[PDB]
């Protein structure tokens, strides 16, 4: 009956959970990026050391200001973008809680049941006539 035809919530609820999942996924991806960034930094540092080391060796044989420029530019860019994305993730998560409001049980459920019941009454009246 119309009472048992109120399982549309189970799809609507689905949508709800789906959003959360997607939201979480966003967070997940962000974390990964952040970690990569740190790893990137590590590699960068190592490279410098290696370069430093080779300089020593090269100096042993005797007796740049643009690679670092773009390195620092893109590093500050990634840091600013990670800050913006973390703020956006906080905002998205908080907006999702302010959306898990209403429904998911007896408020938005009986409303659907009653509307379906009215639709049924109208259809029965039309068929009878």
């Amino acid at each position: 009956g119309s009472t048992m035809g109120a399982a549309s919530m189970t799809l609507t609820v689905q949508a709800r959970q789906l959003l959360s999942g997607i939201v979480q996924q966003q967070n997940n991806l962000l974390r990964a990026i952040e970690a990569q960034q740190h790893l990137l930094q590590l590699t960068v540092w190592g490279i410098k050391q290696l370069q430093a080391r080779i300089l020593a060796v090269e100096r042993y044989l005797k007796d740049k200001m643009e690679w670092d420029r773009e390195i620092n530019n893109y590093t500050s860019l990634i840091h600013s973008l990670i800050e913006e994305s973390q703020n956006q993730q906080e905002k998205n998560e908080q907006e999702l809680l302010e959306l898990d409001k209403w429904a998911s049980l007896w408020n938005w459920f009986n409303i659907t049941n009653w509307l379906w019941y009215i639709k049924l009454f109208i259809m029965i009246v039309g068929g009878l006539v």
Partner: nanobody
Amino acid sequence: EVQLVESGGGLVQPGGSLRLSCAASGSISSVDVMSWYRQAPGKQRELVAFITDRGRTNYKVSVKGRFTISRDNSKNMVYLQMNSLKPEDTADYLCRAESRTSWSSPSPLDVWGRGTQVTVS
């Protein structure tokens, strides 16, 4: 119209526990949602947790597993148990009564409190 009063605030060492209490004037058994927010100096008013008239509880991502919202309809009370507090949890905490329009409420209920301060340092 219901009126909300916060209590139970104070300062606590990082890792301590507190129990905030929103005392509502009227019976909140018919209030659709009772929510705990927090607001820090210079930051936004963050929704921390919320319970419904049917007991549906949900929390914030940074506080899930260490905050616990609960309700006592006999005392008309909404409690918020705070555990393992971080310095990030320092804010003036508010409680809000929300009620969308239904069959008994002609006007939507939107009541704020004056908040109790919670410091973790």
